[PDB]
Structure 1
Amino acid sequence: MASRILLNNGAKMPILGLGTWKSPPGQVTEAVKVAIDVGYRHIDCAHVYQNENEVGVAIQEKLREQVVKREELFIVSKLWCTYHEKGLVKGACQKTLSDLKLDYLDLYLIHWPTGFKPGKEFFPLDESGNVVPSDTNILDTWAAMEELVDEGLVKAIGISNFNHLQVEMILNKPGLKYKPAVNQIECHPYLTQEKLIQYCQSKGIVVTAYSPLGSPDRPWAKPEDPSLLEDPRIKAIAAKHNKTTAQVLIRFPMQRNLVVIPKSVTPERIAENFKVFDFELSSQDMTTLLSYNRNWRVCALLSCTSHKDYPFHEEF
């Protein structure tokens, strides 16, 4: 299987990337350096992760070392919810570019479909704990994203955590100039996303699977939640293939024509997670993994559930 997938902007995107949410700032520079050394060419970032400066130090060092050329890297970031307004989008993108020490992004995503009140706080709340919306809509935010392409700041634009109706809304936008290249969504054997993936793929939008290992380090994890990495059924498939459970969990989305972005700051795991291009899951393995769906989400948030554009009320 090829290492890159063709996007609808004509560029190629590496199907395996390194995630950086929760990667501590004192560890992520080394994580990204190791990742590039062992073959990663795609890094998934976001302003809200609060570590783009440190990710950027690694990228810049490897460019300076001539370990890789800029054209060989595929750097992704995301517009945070408090920057959905017309007059804030460019500055938000530029702050990310400055922190990453880049002059363009390969892909810039609307991080969530919901706009929040601008200000210092990433999650502005009312006194009862509800997020404070902005009156921005996804269509006007999309127009602002299109401007970034036309200014040379980003090579591709896309969306993240958009449900099928929200994706449709963008595709049906009056005067749409650039289609979204990517929809980045949670996807793993407990949240298999067949419906949304089929819709996006049918429209030529590439899907990136986040939290492919079930995000065991998510800060809201409870001791009782289901655990992909410990599921004996998945362990059995891994054993049959002489691979680790994580390697199976990474290979799974790859064979569905998805991009996948496992996170690690552990050098041995960063390397392990990349060793997924030399085995194949059978069709029976794939269907068996799909059968584990339970509609379980890592990534949901009670404080945002009343926002008009909260994505997870819809079935898909």
Structure 2
Amino acid sequence: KYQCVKLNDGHFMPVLGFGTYAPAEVPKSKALEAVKLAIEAGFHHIDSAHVYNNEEQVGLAIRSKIADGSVKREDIFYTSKLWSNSHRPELVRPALERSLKNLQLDYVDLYLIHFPVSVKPGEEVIPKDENGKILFDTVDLCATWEAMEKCKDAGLAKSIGVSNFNHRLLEMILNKPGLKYKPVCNQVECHPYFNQRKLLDFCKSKDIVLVAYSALGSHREEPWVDPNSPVLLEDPVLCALAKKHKRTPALIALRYQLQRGVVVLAKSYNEQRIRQNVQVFEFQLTSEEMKAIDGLNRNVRYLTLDIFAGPPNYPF
């Protein structure tokens, strides 16, 4: 057994997920090993994406752990995401089916719209013209969502959701005429420097689960993240809570999210840290500790994806 939350479609999501993105200077081999170690440690939820360029490796890890008897397929919650070169409705199912072929899995547990700004179709994930300009595309995300619904009805995705959506974009889906399935989740950046209280409450009001990424202050990969941003885990309040509990600041940051009703991702490719992170289930924070962490909020967004700024659907 392991801790899960019931989604608005009746499926269950494990509340601690393993993040699989690593910057390109990290060999893809490392993904295979790290996912195996995460499953061994007790992660039951694994987060990936077509754009991470690691589905072959992540899928092999999962297949391996199934085939050697370590875990059953029903005890792994696997998430993929629809990249922005496949927003057009007729391209949605093919992108899911391409991810599934790479993974050699029959279905994903969850399929998300990765990012709300669309780019032109083709193999290239960031298509550019001759002059370096991103080739943006104009697509009705409501149409994309109907295609996602169809994938759910096909059994290719058990659940569907969104990522990096703001209030306005969530509302566009929620108010869509003929809506079949609400998003089960909105996967967004969330940590004690950017605690997303407003958007969290909105999502709660609609029984949409907020899934936190960069919960430990991000990969900090350039140019995606400003190197001059503060380092979350050096925070002196987090460090003193850690000392107090004989834990680590990472574990404090993880535990904060679980208690506020957020599902939390954590990426690590380091064996010790992977094992550490599952200790989030071993302790609890008091109401005064939770309020101390709430106090850290400082409107610091690590991940702007500002190469996609300009189009109306840019969410920040």
TM-score range, shorter chain: over 0.9
Match of 1:246 among 233, 250, 256: 250
- The unaligned stretches of length 5 or more in structure 1 are none
The corresponding residue for 1:159 is 162
> 1:137 and 2:140 equivalent?
yes
What is the Cα deviation at residue 211 of structure 1?
0.5
The 8 Å contact of residues 104 and 152 in structure 1, kept in 2 or not, is answered as yes
2:291 counterpart letter in structure 1: T
2:230 maps to a residue whose letter is P
User: Equivalent pairs: percent with the same residue?
Assistant: 49
- In the alignment, structure 1 residue 26 sits paired with structure 2 residue 21: no
| Matching of residue 61 in structure 1 with residue 33 in structure 2 | no
Name the CA shift for 1:223/1:142 in 2 (closer, same or farther; >3 Å): closer
Corresponding residue number in structure 1 for 2:110: 107
| 2:267 alignment partner in structure 1 | 263
The 4+ residue runs of structure 1 with deviation greater than 6 A are: none
Counterpart residue identity of residue 291, structure 1 = G
Partner SS for 2:157: coil
CA RMSD of the aligned region, Å? 1.3
Aligned-partner residue type, residue 110 of structure 1: I
For the pair 1:226 / 2:230, whether they are aligned, the reply is yes
- Whole-angstrom CA distance in 2 between matches of 1:164 and 1:126: 32
Which whole-Å CA distance do the structure 1 matches of 2:93 and 2:7 have between them?
Answer: 23
Using the alignment, how far apart are the partners of 2:112 and 2:53 within structure 1?
Answer: 16
Distance (Å, rounded) in 1 between the aligned partners of 2:138 and 2:315: 16
User: 1:24–1:51: 8 Å Cα contact kept in structure 2?
Assistant: no
1:147 is aligned to 2:159: no
Q: Which amino acid aligns with 2:88?
A: E
Match among 168, 171, 193 for residue 171 of structure 2: 168
Distance 2:314 2:213 in 1: 18
Aligned AA (2:80)? S
Structure 2 counterpart SS, 1:275 = helix
Q: For 1:35, which of 33, 38, 43 is the aligned residue?
A: 38
CA shift for structure 1 position 137: 1.6
1:130 positional shift: 4.3
CA contact (8 A) 2:220 2:227 kept: no
Residues paired across the two proteins, number: 311
Check conservation: 1:130, 1:304, Cα contact below 8 A: no
Choose which of 306, 311, 314 in structure 1 pairs with 2:315.
311
2:243 partner letter: A
Contact 1:130 1:303 in 2 (8 A): no
1:285 partner amino acid: E
Asked if the contact 2:84/2:114 (under 8 Å) is kept, the reply is yes
TM-score, reference length from structure 2: 0.95
Counterpart residue number, 2:280: 276
Q: Name the TM-score, length of structure 1 as normaliser.
A: 0.95
Comparing 219-228 with 8-17, which one deviates more in the overlay? 219-228
* Secondary structure of 2:282 counterpart: coil
CA displacement at 1:186 relative to structure 2: 0.3
Cα distance, 1:152 vs structure 2:
1.1
Deviation string for 1:139-171 (max 9, x for gaps)? 011001001011110110000000011111100
Indicate the residue corresponding to 1:120 in structure 2. Answer: 123
- After TM superposition, give the deviation of residue 222 of structure 1 in Å: 4.3
Matches within 5 A, 1:282-297: 282-297=286-301
